[PDB]
Paper text:
LpxA and LpxD are functionally and structurally similar, sharing a homotrimer architecture and conserved active site features, especially in the acyl-chain binding pockets that reside in the dimer interface of the β-helix trimer core. Herein we report the discovery of several small molecules that bind to both P. aeruginosa LpxA and LpxD with μM affinity, identified using a targeted structure-based methodology that utilizes molecular docking, surface plasmon resonance (SPR) bioanalysis, and high-resolution X-ray crystallography.
Our LpxD complex structure with compound 1 (2.60 Å) showed distinguishable electron density corresponding to the ligand at the dimer interface formed via crystallographic symmetry. The fitted binding pose suggests that there are two hydrogen bonds stabilizing the protein-ligand complex, both with the backbone nitrogen atoms of two glycine residues, Gly272 and Gly278, from the adjacent monomers forming the active site. Additionally, compound 1 establishes extensive non-polar interactions with residues Ala253, Gly257, Ala271, Leu276, Val277 and Met293, which may also be critical for the hydrophobic contacts with the substrate acyl chain. Compared with the LpxA structure, the ligand’s aromatic ring goes deeper into the LpxD structure, consistent with a slightly larger acyl-chain binding pocket in LpxD. Two conformational changes are observed in LpxD upon ligand binding, one being Ser259. In its apo form, the Ser259 side chain normally points inwards towards the active site. However, the naphthalene ring of compound 1 forces this residue to rotate outwards to avoid steric clash. One of the most interesting observations in the LpxD complex structure is how ligand binding in the acyl-chain binding pocket triggers movement in the distal C-terminal helix, suggesting possible cross-talk between the catalytic pocket and ACP binding site. Our complex structure suggests the possibility of coordination between substrate binding in the active site and ARD binding by ACP. Additionally, there was some residual weak electron density in the active site of LpxD complex crystal with compound 1 suggesting that another ligand copy could possibly be accommodated, although its low occupancy prevented it from being unambiguously identified and modeled at the current resolution.
Residue numbers in the entry:
A (entry chain A), B (entry chain A), C (entry chain A): 4 to 340
The structure:
Amino acid sequence: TLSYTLGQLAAHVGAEVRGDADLPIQGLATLQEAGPAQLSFLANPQYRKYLPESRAGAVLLTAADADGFAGTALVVANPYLAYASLSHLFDRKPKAAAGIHPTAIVAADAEVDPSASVGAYAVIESGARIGAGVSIGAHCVIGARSVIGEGGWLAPRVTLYHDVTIGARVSIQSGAVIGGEGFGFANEKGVWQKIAQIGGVTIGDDVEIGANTTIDRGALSDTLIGNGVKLDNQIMIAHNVQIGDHTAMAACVGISGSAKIGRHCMLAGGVGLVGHIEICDNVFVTGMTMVTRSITEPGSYSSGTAMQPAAEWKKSAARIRQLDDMARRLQQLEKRL
Amino acid sequence: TLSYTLGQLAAHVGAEVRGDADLPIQGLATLQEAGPAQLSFLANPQYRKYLPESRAGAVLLTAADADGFAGTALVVANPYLAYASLSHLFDRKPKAAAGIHPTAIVAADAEVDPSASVGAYAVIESGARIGAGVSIGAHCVIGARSVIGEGGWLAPRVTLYHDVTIGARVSIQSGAVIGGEGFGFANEKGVWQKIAQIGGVTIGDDVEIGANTTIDRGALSDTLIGNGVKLDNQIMIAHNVQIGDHTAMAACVGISGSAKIGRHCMLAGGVGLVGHIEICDNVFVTGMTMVTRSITEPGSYSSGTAMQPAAEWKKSAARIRQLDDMARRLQQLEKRL
Amino acid sequence: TLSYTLGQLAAHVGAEVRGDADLPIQGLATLQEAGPAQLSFLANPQYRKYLPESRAGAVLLTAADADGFAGTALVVANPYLAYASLSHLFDRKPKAAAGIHPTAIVAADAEVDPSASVGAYAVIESGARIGAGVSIGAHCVIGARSVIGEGGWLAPRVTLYHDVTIGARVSIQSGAVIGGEGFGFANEKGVWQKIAQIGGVTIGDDVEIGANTTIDRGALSDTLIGNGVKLDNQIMIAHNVQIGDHTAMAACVGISGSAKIGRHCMLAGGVGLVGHIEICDNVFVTGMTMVTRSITEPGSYSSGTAMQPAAEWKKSAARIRQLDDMARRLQQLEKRL
Ligand SMILES: O=C(O)CCC(=O)c1cccc2ccccc12
Ligand SMILES: O=C(O)CCC(=O)c1cccc2ccccc12
Ligand SMILES: O=C(O)CCC(=O)c1cccc2ccccc12
Ligand SMILES: [Mg+2]
């Protein structure tokens, strides 16, 4: 097991020990799943009720929660952010150290920093470029002239096409496909005719791309993902979308061709965006919303209906089908009075 | 071709022959696509009209349907369940018999039952564990310390991360990713900060996982899939979801972080569940529903609207935008009478 | 760089030069991103305002737009379709010329036209059949007795199962899975029992299949994709669906078991179709629509609600919950007058 003292861990997030710093810790855990060997935290004002009964060894707490506290504490401004920081010290994910696999193919035109690792059966086409301390997983395919900046981590079975440019510290889960040819077809008298896709992709720094997520290449200009953009799993980004820095998109979100999302935007799960619209900075879209027109006011937007028992849903739908009569009924009365 | 007598096939589901058991059969087919060489069935009271004209050789039938029947029958309590049983005898899917491929990599720390098969270019990291009569397809990646119980069938290009524990008789279609790092980020003054994902996955026995489906690893505790849980394709299960045994989820369903589904639940296609809610046992959610709050009453739940021609949809939406006036109009009249 | 004269390019789409045909061109570009080295076009009557200020070298234009035009033009009936045609001459996607990779496995029972290419670590099972001038990418898996007609292009990490038959000039982006076993289970007293999937797939000619798209094999008959059918990314086609020739489906669309779509149909993004319904020819379904019943009238169909600010959405939902009172209120008044 990986284990550390409260002192080593307090050091990492600059906390104050309020028991004994000598106490070993072997992993992290929620308030009411935590053992004596484990560090927890209170982030939610709500779970304030559940703190005393925790068998946690130690607890990341604001000075306020820590005050009159039965146990040993680690005191910090933001427990959750400290929790977030500490989480990496307990990550048991393997880290295949530097060098290529004999199996992995690499074109003679491909630069590949010595500090980087390429896993089994990998492939790397002509003009590729693997920046420093990058980690490329097994069965990954990098396409021609595609670029992963330093600190990148690509899980196995990730595919880049030709002409995909990525900043530093990229994180890409398995199954991801970047630079694919999206729907582009013209209608010649009711037959679809292939518009070839001759843009590429450009992705800034510190970007997460979740598993089985697809990002289409541009039609002419590049598909643009800004810096610190966090994309969950099963996401679809069409050709020529632009995403503002620090925008977060939850799972199963689909953005149509040429849509532009400003900065610090949050799209909840299974949001769709029609093509050729613009979303201004600081927009929250609630889950399974269909965004149909550009957004200029920052704030929160929804579509959908209240969940009901199916029977009540049928009565609602029917009450909705009779709105016309009700407005006819209501105009006949408007006359006589 | 694979072929069998009505007797061999009656044996397998303990049916009564009501023609001659000597009659060869070469495959199965629907009532009104069936040839003389083929066994059909009546499961639907509805298709009772379509039975006489069937050119089926033989028909799995309840005693009731079989009575006064022109053709040769196989009599059973449940034709459809008998149909289901017989279906496997006509499955032409290859079965790469035991042993590893020279190509496949296996770490020295990995146990791999002799009875199991590992296909071309496979990969198996340190501390892996391939139970007995498991079948691992080509380009599969098993991650470190991950465990497939006996009878497992993993199609090609399936990915397990580190620390994925799976019961017996697992069936996983291609493209599936289990143990991926889902969206977990804290907001440091408008920048997303990686919460590392240090849970794993635990999956019980007799579980189906469809193609390109993703199951996230836990943040701290494991992601939990109970026994006999049937997940269609393109599904997304976020970190720390719990699924009750015998729950079925149709394609394109997305379950957010920490949601709990009880047992014998049915989620129709493209249902979404917001995070941190609980669904009690025996809930049916109709297709493309957004479930926003916990469910305590067993039964059937919906959201969405009646499909209309687009023009009528526009008149509905407009009739809905004027509900406020209609309640103002209706309060002015409420006064004077 | 690839470069061509206006004359060579006018030749390809039979246009009339209305400056000098000697002028080299190095790529294509939108009206107001175009440099002097680049050919643009006016397809949209809307962007007619943006033509004069374009730094485009040359512009594909209808005679009408070209008339009194400051720059050098290429004159054609349909600029956009000419644009579509020309686009392929600037496609920088690599093209791994004929022959197999030493790495690639091929069964002795597999025919593989000499004109075709199979990339690194590919796999091709018994009874396969790679028609002429087909291109199979790295890590592709073709399953047993599956057939790609001539002119096919399969990106890397594409998976075919056993018994998948495909016409000519197929285009399949990465991550695609064709012939997977979809949800098929019977309920034996609340336990799901595997119905084996013993149909295959049949796909006509000139078909696009986008990335991470899944197409299920048939239960008994084949899954059917007609000719010139264009499927975007992240799409799910259940067992035994039928798609009419020239039907287009945008990204994240999900079609349930046994649904039939006629010809020249357009499904916008994230449309769902319930199983066992029929859609007649020439139907447009707007984005994120749930189609619940068969469609017989050609035209345009919708479900969903108008996007609102979340607050207004809450007032709408509440105004909708009080429709019953409003119809009670409206019946009490209907009495007294
Ligand atoms: O659920 C939360 O409350 C936050 C994350 C989120 O938006 C999400 C993730 C996955 C599937 C979903 C389905 C419906 C609504 C939301 C989601
Ligand atoms: O369609 C049925 O009636 C049963 C299976 C099912 O729920 C389904 C599967 C795939 C896509 C869907 C889209 C909308 C609604 C349902 C589905
Ligand atoms: O958006 C257009 O206007 C045309 C293409 C399209 O229908 C689309 C593509 C991807 C995601 C979507 C989400 C919602 C609505 C439409 C889409
Ligand atoms: Mg979806």
